[PDB]
Amino acid sequence: GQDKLKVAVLFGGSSEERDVSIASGAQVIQALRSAGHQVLAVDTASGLLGAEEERRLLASKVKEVGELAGVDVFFLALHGGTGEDGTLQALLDAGGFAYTGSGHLASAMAMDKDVAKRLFLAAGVETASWLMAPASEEEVREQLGFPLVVKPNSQGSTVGLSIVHSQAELQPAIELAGRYGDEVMLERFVAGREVTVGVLDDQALPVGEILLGGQEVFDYEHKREVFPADLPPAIAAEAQRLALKVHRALKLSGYSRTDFRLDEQGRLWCLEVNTLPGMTATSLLPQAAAAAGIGFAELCERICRLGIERCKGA
Amino acid sequence: QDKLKVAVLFGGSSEERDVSIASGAQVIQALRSAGHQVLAVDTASGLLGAEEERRLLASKVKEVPPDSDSLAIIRSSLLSAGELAGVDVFFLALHGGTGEDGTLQALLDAGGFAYTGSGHLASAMAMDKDVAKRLFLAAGVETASWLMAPASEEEVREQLGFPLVVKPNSQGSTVGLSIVHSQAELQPAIELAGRYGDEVMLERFVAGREVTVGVLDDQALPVGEILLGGQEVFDYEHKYQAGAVREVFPADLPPAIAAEAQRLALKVHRALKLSGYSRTDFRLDEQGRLWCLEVNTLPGMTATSLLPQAAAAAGIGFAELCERICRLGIERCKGARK
């Protein structure tokens, strides 16, 4: 009961992002089509896909490497830095193009884990103490302690991350993280449960928990999902309150996913916020939307219409 | 110290073109006086013609069609065609949002082009005065209390008080700062600051002096003081009639105060991850405390601008300042990741 859209679904990106991005793009195309919208498939490498290319994209779920008129919005089905660093959002802002998710400044600030954690604190959102390399042996032991996490500041997740168990592992881990990024974070590790909060428009979705068998640091490094998570209602409500504060503090738009550590004393520690969380039917934010009665196709459409209305009011 | 091939990029939106063109011509002559090959590039048309560059340098004009695109150089190719091949760096002789919001820097990054000044994230954060002030506090740099409009009478009373300053949130707008002395003056000023749709800041007014600190790479330049006129506030983007404001480089300050302003400017420059050069503005109260107002990633590059005066006070002439900024942009590009 609402006018149908012409959506261009953008996917692809760098080689390390393509497999996740291609799988998401195909699912988003099919979902918006089942809702009756006209969908165009665009690869960041080859451009607009023809009937044969799109047929093989929607079949094998893989793709190897002035006609966008009437397109109401660009659905950014990207993953990692290609969609997070803000370059594409700024380019689309220049042309008056409508797109999904956060804008250039909001995306770039969220990809900078260091700057994002500064803004968490300024918004009254607790976050684990951290230093940026270089850091002396005294600063690390005084403010962080061991064990601690070393990771590149802006290069996605997992890649280049390692746990520092003592002062003798700090410099090797910094060198390892330095192979993937220019800046390196030294973050205090918080033992506890892994909790995530999706935000859609201006409402927080049901809280979820990611359970790798354990709460110590071996589990964090060597990594079921419960929506809604098994949490005392006050703790779940506080994670939702803080996720909304983080969403507004970074001036995000459309949707976002904020990760927390929940320690044994019941206090939430904000890790990061993703402006481009995975968009498949089984991804974290779509799972949270399902716990609120919102299917994957309705989620993709709502995100499309949120991006349209943002471009209108700019 | 081999001679460079520099593309001086000027133009921007209609409200920025006048001061941007004046800066572009001055930067072209300065770099040409230093022995470099320089090309004039308009954001709305690309490389200039012979008659167009003659008029640019002689009368500081380059009128452009009414349907012209203030950013035609990136949506294409104007940046690589013709003599622009082999350009070492693009000097951004821009003013206002076109050079501050980070869009141009992001697309220049995507094209692999070297350019002057801070990158796209650093420029965008600094242009957002609210976000920048949050980061001032995170860096241990004091800044006056502030609220974003709308704010209740209770919030304004307990957190700010009167007098306060109403201003647009984004650097590079055309709306000026306005001092508000009572609750009745608040809403008319907020309406006059949000005419064009961006956020409105309410910042506690700090009685005292207006000082500004230029930074070149990692070096704090001599502090300057801006001497105002009446019961008002200085506006770093207002034109002002001649003789209205007087600028003193180096400022007549107690040395521990001037040294502290220089230390705080470098912390701000590092905190927002700026590059090349910047200008950090403070209010200095009667107790000798510095309150940071903003940091500018695109301070004016003319003989009458603040940073060239700071550089000159340190024995750095305008041509030398322009060349150093060029080389800093080249060095940053050569050090880029992949």
A95 touches chain B (CB under 8 A): yes
Q: Give the active site residue among B11, B12, B16, B24.
A: B16
* Interchain CB contact of A84 with B (< 8 Å): no
Residues of A in contact with B267 (CB under 8 A): none
Instruction: Report the C-alpha gap between A113 and B278 in whole angstroms.
Output: 24
Note whether B71 contacts A: Cβ–Cβ < 8 A. yes
B84: DSSP letter: G
CA distances from A94 to A83, B87, B88, B195 (A): 16, 25, 26, 21
* Residue B154 designated active-site: no
- Between strands B277-284 and B290-296, the pairing is antiparallel
d(CA A244, CA A234): 15
Is B2 among the residues known to form the active site? no
Whole-angstrom distance between the N-terminal and C-terminal Cα of chain A? 26
Q: Contact at 8 Å (CB) between B226 and B283?
A: no
Tell me which chain A residues have a C-beta less than 8 angstroms from the C-beta of B131: 105, 109, 119, 251
Which ranges of chain B would DSSP assign to H, the alpha helix?
17-33, 50-59, 97-100, 103-110, 120-127, 129-138, 153-155, 183-193, 255-271, 306-313, 318-334
Decide if A119 contacts A127 (C-beta within 8 A).
Answer: no
Which DSSP state fits B157?
I
The active-site residue, picked from B23, B24, B277, B279, is B279
Residue found by looking up tokens 């149908």 in the block = A4
Min Cα–Cα distance to chain B from A250, Å: 9
Alpha-carbon dihedral sign for residues A286, A289, A295, A298: negative
Name all contacts of B269-274 with Cβ < 8 Å and 24+ positions apart: B269/B215, B269/B295, B270/B139, B271/B135, B271/B136, B271/B138, B271/B139, B271/B141, B272/B118, B272/B122, B272/B125, B272/B126, B272/B132, B272/B135, B273/A115, B273/B118, B273/B119, B273/B121, B273/B122, B274/B118, B274/B122, B274/B126, B274/B215
CA atoms within 13 A on the CB side of A130: 29
Long-range own/partner contacts, residues A227-235 (CB < 8 A, 24 or more apart): A227/A287, A227/A288, A227/A290, A227/A291, A228/A291, A229/A195, A231/A195, A231/A207, A231/A262, A232/A266, A235/A262, A235/A266, A235/A268
Does A237 contact B at CB distance below 8 Å? no
**Cβ–Cβ of A182/B128 closer than 8 Å?**
no
Q: Does A104 touch chain B (CB under 8 A)?
A: yes
**A201 touches A176 (CB < 8 A):** no
Q: Do B124 and A105 touch (CB under 8 A)?
A: yes
Of B117, B289, B290, which is closest to residue B216 (Cα–Cα)?
Answer: B117
Q: How many angstroms away from the CA of B122 is the closest CA of chain A? A: 9
Closest by CA position to A151, among listed A166, A164, A167: A164
Which residues does residue A274 pair with via DSSP β-bridges, in sequence order?
Answer: A257
Q: Report CA A99 to chain centroid distance, whole Å.
A: 16
Residue B158: DSSP 8-state: I
CB B232 within 8 A of CB B238: no
Given a contact cutoff of 8 angstroms between Cβ atoms, the answer to whether B23 and B301 are in contact is yes
A52 phi and psi, to 5 degrees?
-70, -45
Catalytic one among B12, B46, B300, B329? B300
Q: Which residue has the tokens 């390692």?
A: A162
User: Exposed (0-12), middle (13-18) or buried (19+): which is A124, by Cβ within 10 Å?
Assistant: exposed
Q: Does B148 touch chain A (CB under 8 A)?
A: no
Evaluated on CA atoms B254, B256, B261, B266, the torsion sign reads positive
Among all residues of chain B, which has the CA nearest to that of A110? B121
Q: Which chain A positions have a beta carbon within 8 Å of B137's beta carbon?
A: 122
Q: What are the tokens at B268?
A: 């701000």
User: Listing from the earlier edge strand, what are the strands of the sheet with A38-43?
Assistant: A47-48, A38-43, A6-11, A73-76
- What is d(CA B33, CA B24) in angstroms, rounded to the nearest whole number? 14
CA dist A246 and A259 (Å) reads: 11
Q: Which of A94, A109, A119 lies nearest to residue B75, judging by beta carbons?
A: A94
Q: Among all residues of chain A, which has the CA nearest to that of B335? A: A182
Q: Coil, helix or strand for B276? A: coil
Nearest to A135, CA basis, from A167, A176, A179, A181: A167
What is the DSSP code (8-state) at residue B115? B
Q: List all residues of chain B from 252 to 291 with a beta carbon under 8 Å from chain A.
A: 273
B298-310 burial, b for 16+ CB within 10 Å, e for fewer?
bbbbbeebbbbbb
List Cα–Cα distances, B337 to A183, B112, B152, in angstroms.
11, 11, 47
Burial of A29 (0-12, 13-18, 19+ CB in 10 A): buried
Q: CA-to-CA distance for B26 and A269, rounded, in angstroms? A: 52
How far from A43 is each of A46, B21, B226, CA to CA, in Å?
5, 39, 53
Distance, in Å, from the CA atom of A151 to the CA atom of A147, rounded to the nearest integer, reads 13
Cβ distance B103 to A94 less than 8 Å, yes or no, reads yes
Experimental technique of record: X-ray
How many Å separate Cα B70 from the centre of its chain?
A: 18
Residue A108 contacts B where some CB pair is shorter than 8 Å: yes
Whether A285 contacts A203, CB under 8 Å: no
- Distance CA(B186)–CA(B190), nearest Å, equals 6
Resolution as reported, in Å? 2.0
Q: Which residues contact A53 (CB under 8 A, 6 or more apart)?
A: A41, A46, A63
Largest CA distance in chain A: 63
Interhelix angle A15-34/A51-60, nearest 10 degrees: 100
Q: ∠ CA(A92), CA(A15), CA(A98), 5° rounding?
A: 15
Q: Kindly list the residues from chain B whose CB atom is less than 8 angstroms away from the CB atom of residue A108.
A: 102, 120-121, 124
Reduce the DSSP state of residue B121 to 3 states and report it. Answer: helix
Cis peptide before B168 (omega within 30 of 0): no
CB atoms within 10 A of CB B145: 14
When scoring A104, A117, A180 by the number of chain B Cβ atoms within 10 A, the one with the most, hence best to mutate, is: A104
Distance of alpha carbon A152 from alpha carbon A185, whole angstroms: 6
Backbone angles phi, psi at B163, to 5 degrees: -80, 150
End-to-end CA distance of chain B: 26
A298 exposed, middle or buried (CB, 10 Å; 0-12, 13-18, 19+)?
A: middle
Phi, psi at B47, each rounded to 5°: -60, 135
Nearest-CA distance B107 → chain A (Å):
7
Residue A138 Cα distances to A114, A135, A184, angstroms: 20, 8, 18
Minimum distance, in Å, between the CA of residue A155 and any CA atom of chain B: 12
Q: Angle, to 10 degrees, between the axis of helix A113-122 and the axis of helix B129-138?
A: 90
What region, left, alpha or beta, does residue B241 occupy, with left being phi > 0 and alpha being psi -120 to 50 degrees?
beta
Is there a binding annotation on residue A302?
no
Counted across chains A and B, CB pairs separated by less than 8 A come out at 66
State the Cα–Cα distance between residues B154 and B183, nearest whole angstrom.
11
Q: Which of B47, B7, B42 is nearest to B28 (CA)?
A: B7
- B279 counts as catalytic: yes
Paired sense of beta strands A73-76 and A47-48, if any: unpaired
Q: How is chain A classified by DSSP, letter by letter? A: -----EEEEEE--SHHHHHHHHHHHHHHHHHHHHTT-EEEEEETTTEE--HHHHHHHHHHS-------TT--EEEE---THHHHSSHHHHHHHHTT--BSS--HHHHHHHH-HHHHHHHHHHTT-----EEESS--HHHIIIII-SSEEEEESSS-SSTT-EEE-SGGGHHHHHHHHHTT-SSEEEEE---SEEEEEEEETTEEPPPEEE--S-SSHHHHHT--EESS-S--HHHHHHHHHHHHHHHHHTT--SEEEEEEEE-TTS-EEEEEEESS---STTSHHHHHHHTTT--HHHHHHHHHHHHHHHHH--
Q: How far apart are CA A230 and CA B106, in angstroms?
A: 43
Query: Is A252 one of the annotated binding-site residues?
Result: no
One DSSP character per residue, B132-149 reads HHHHHHHTT-----EEES
Tokens in use for B89?
């760096």
A212 and B CB contact within 8 Å: no
| Minimum distance, in Å, between the CA of residue B31 and any CA atom of chain A | 30
Q: Residues A132, A113: contact at Cβ < 8 Å?
A: no
Element housing B245 (H / E): none
Beta strands at A208-210 and A203-204: parallel, antiparallel or unpaired: unpaired
* Residue A192 · residue A151 · CB < 8 Å: no
